Design a protein around this nucleic acid. Structure first.
Ligand SMILES: [K+]
Ligand SMILES: [Mn+2]
Ligand SMILES: [Mn+2]
Ligand SMILES: [Mn+2]
Ligand SMILES: [Mn+2]
Ligand SMILES: [Mn+2]
Length: 136
RNA sequence: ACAU
DNA sequence: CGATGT
């Protein structure tokens, strides 16, 4: 209903799907960019959406912040809840990097706690999430 | 049918 | 038009 402006917004960006994947996190209120992941040669949109949330959790935890995280990805929000990224991406040499990062993100979830609310950004009501890359 |  | 997901 109401945007929680005191929040962190995260989003994937890509060149192809599967393709080059990156992600960033921004202050929902100001748009200030707070982190940006270096492009990963091959990944899926949903893997990046997932890594973005987990990085957000780790970022806020390190800084003792209780802000929620917004993501526009139904899939990634569920993967984080389940602590299991059920990606269909083949495991081969090409995809080894992204799969390592995803496996490690899952491992972090299974060994750490958080109270961070993970909220659905309501794109249909509010427009693009503020971490969007503007490529669509 | 919803979300990317 | 194609792909990734529940
Ligand atoms: K969107
Ligand atoms: Mn997104
Ligand atoms: Mn795994
Ligand atoms: Mn986007
Ligand atoms: Mn367009
Ligand atoms: Mn489009």
């Amino acid at each position: 209903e109401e945007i929680i402006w005191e929040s962190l917004s995260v989003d994937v960006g890509s060149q192809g799907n599967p393709g080059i994947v990156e992600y960033k996190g921004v202050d929902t209120k100001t748009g200030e960019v707070l982190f940006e992941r270096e492009p990963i040669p091959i990944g899926t949109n949903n893997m990046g959406e997932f890594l973005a949330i987990v990085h957000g959790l780790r970022y806020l935890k390190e800084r003792n912040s209780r802000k929620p995280i917004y993501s526009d990805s139904q899939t990634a929000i569920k993967w984080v809840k389940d602590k299991k990224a059920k990606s269909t991406l083949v495991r081969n040499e090409e995809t080894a990097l992204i799969w390592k990062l995803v496996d490690e993100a899952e491992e972090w979830l299974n060994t750490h706690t958080y109270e961070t609310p993970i909220l659905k950004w309501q794109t249909d009501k509010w427009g693009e999430i503020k971490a969007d890359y503007g490529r669509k």
